[PDB]
Design a protein around this ligand. Sequence first.
Ligand SMILES: N#Cc1ccc2c(Oc3ccccc3OCCn3ccc(=S)[nH]c3=O)cccc2c1
Lengths: 527, 388
Amino acid sequence: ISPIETVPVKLKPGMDGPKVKQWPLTEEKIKALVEICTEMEKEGKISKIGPENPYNTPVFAIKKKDSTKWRKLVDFRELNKRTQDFWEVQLGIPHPAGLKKKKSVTVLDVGDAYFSVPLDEDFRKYTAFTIPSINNETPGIRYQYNVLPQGWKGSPAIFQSSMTKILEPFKKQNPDIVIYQYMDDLYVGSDLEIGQHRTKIEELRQHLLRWGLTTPDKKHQKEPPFLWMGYELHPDKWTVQPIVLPEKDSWTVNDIQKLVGKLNWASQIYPGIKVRQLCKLLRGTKALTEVIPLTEEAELELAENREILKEPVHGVYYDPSKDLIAEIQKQGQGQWTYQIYQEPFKNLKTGKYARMRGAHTNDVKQLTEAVQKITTESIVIWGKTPKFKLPIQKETWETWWTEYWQATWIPEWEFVNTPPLVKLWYQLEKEPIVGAETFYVDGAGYVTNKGRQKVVPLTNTQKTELQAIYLALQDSGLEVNIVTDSQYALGIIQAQPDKSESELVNQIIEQLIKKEKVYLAWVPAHK
Amino acid sequence: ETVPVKLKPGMDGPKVKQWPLTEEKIKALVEICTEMEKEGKISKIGPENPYNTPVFAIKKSTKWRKLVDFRELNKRTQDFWEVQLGIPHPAGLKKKKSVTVLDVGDAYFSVPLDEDFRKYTAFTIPSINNETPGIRYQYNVLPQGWKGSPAIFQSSMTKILEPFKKQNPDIVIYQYMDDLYVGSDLEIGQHRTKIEELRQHLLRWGLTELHPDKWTVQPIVLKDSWTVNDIQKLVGKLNWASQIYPGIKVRQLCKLLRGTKALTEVLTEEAELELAENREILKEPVHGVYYDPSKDLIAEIQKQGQGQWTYQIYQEPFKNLKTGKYARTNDVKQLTEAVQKITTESIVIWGKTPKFKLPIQKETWETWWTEYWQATWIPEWEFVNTPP
Ligand SMILES: N#Cc1ccc2c(Oc3ccccc3OCCn3ccc(=S)[nH]c3=O)cccc2c1
């Protein structure tokens, strides 16, 4: 408390301190509030202030959780708005996969920490609250916060900085002990045997006590397994908390949102979770009371998902010496399940790469994006890119890489043999074919060097051109050379979408999946 | 004595977020920053300072170095500085025979910095798996890579380079963001000797090879077989270049196509003078393009494949100021080296460093530019690409 230094805090430039009027309260509320405030003043958390200070933040009395007693909550929206923006506390929880196995791990939750770390003298004035007096006889009793208030914008950042400053000398003196910190709690882990570990944790508690932060007793400390942010941290395995899917017959939009969230959360350890059809249902904006029927495809998806969730799965903590290995599998169209395992059949983390909504791309391009996403998440969690294992053949990758127009790279990878195998369905040639029927199209007919012609009744109202490009394929034969008036059709065909999202692309692909040589060129519109 | 440094009126400082980095890079950054703090160049900051600026570690040599991405703070200050304190650009550097970049980034680690401006230069070293909050820092000495550093150190640089420039009037020296450009029309060996002399000069005063003449604009070329496909290709390219050059017309060649025909054929109507003459209309470089001092340079990189990359620097579209063809290893590496060469040529020709329309995708460049970067400056690249 006393040794903990004060961080300079000031209001935003050009803004005055909060000034709010307190509304009258009930007689039991005011008596409970004055009792609690007097107890705090005895403890020194708050100090009475004179009438010269015009800053006031309203107070509200709420029944304590499962308690008839009326705890005190002070609103801080105004002062939060009028405060210098502090550095945000890190919003990403540590992933249990990146943790390294240690012989003993203890959970130390610092008690009443925001009331232990003090506050700046200049800023103490604005954090003033008034406890009203009945019958309007007196203005009331005023108080101010000598210590970090709760609900304030800067409480997490200031407390985190103070905790780091306090813990630094202990980390310097003992380097083996690793101390994670998330929210208030301190998570301590050492490779020492339990006999020395209990002594070291007692030493840490004494250090925090001499710096004024209370810690739980030895008996009260939790014992494994630990439940933390939906993760069940066993000694040698980590699993997600038991996930039960709703059996509700009629699903509302909010129910679908919860189901998709639970399935996505379960995907991190459970392999083979598919949520794409449910997300397709969810894309239509609707009221939370709106009831959307379950398509047969979505019902199949939910059936296979609930079948997958029936089995239990576990993950394994990271061991630094061995190298990470990541494997991608294409479960279906637009779904790619990726697994990250140091050793075979011991998965650190499973996941899925959902296809971009409303995007049709070549499966090799989707594979490249999945590889990039794996690289990013691996960097964030472990700090090293994995050695990938991908379905695509090296020759197919080289062909698409050299022909494609962007810059695409993939880290070190090898070829694992498994169905399905991702390959370019049609390799358009970039040179013409002699002795083949030269072919002209227009948005739809076939105008030919042989002399055949045709006409399509264009709707009075470009698809007919795509129809013509399709109509070109079946009319010509095995060896075809076509030219196109518009660049759009050439771009669509050159992107080589094996996605087969639309019916016209479907028929084009079905036609040219067997044609041995099809060369398309673009000839400008002739004036 | 500290000089007053002020942000442009009504603008807040940097608040950008750090992109997560590899464990080896984090370790190298931590050790470098700890050593610098012990020397006194950087000092710790608490949570009262929201401002942030990314940190990346590059390797130039087995010693890691730190590149601090000061693009936003530069946007907010160098504009204020350029009018207040500027660096002129010698026009003779482009005509010099040999030009050398000698890094003088160690000067700015001595002279102090304004107390009020110290807070806007804050950087964090990230941690793996969110184990601990990053060790935040601030710069107490002049930053490296911030365009106000040469402006502040200009007086010292002039007083340190005056004797050498007086001794050698032919040498042209120009400074841009921790880089000194030394140009000499002398032969290459004499240039090496002069650069060694300048390095010894700087070292004794407590201060610690591209060829511009060879560069020239790229010619553009535009059918004895008269293959109908080649005639279609020529009419397409001529219709494309119609915007760039007003002279070229493809009407007669269009008549040569004459509609429906078979693809492979062996024919010239009114001869083919048009092909030759339009080749002439192209051989002469574009006319009517002049540098505009108050506009941004944007460079488009186009991937022609086969280890080839064509770039076009242009103030206004369809009026190129310079066209080239870089010829080269992964595609990300090729793009990195292409960007570096393009902007170094831009620096030696005109003052500015171009904005880039990179062909690569956003997250891939974000992930893989740091490994292959080897230059102190950082251009304002645009990840998104226009399909070429
Ligand atoms: N509730 C809660 C809770 C408890 C401990 C956590 C945690 O502990 C470590 C702390 C420091 C180093 C390694 C750690 O963990 C290694 C792996 N590990 C994990 C568990 C067990 S019982 N044993 C073991 O070795 C790190 C992060 C979050 C934590 C949350």
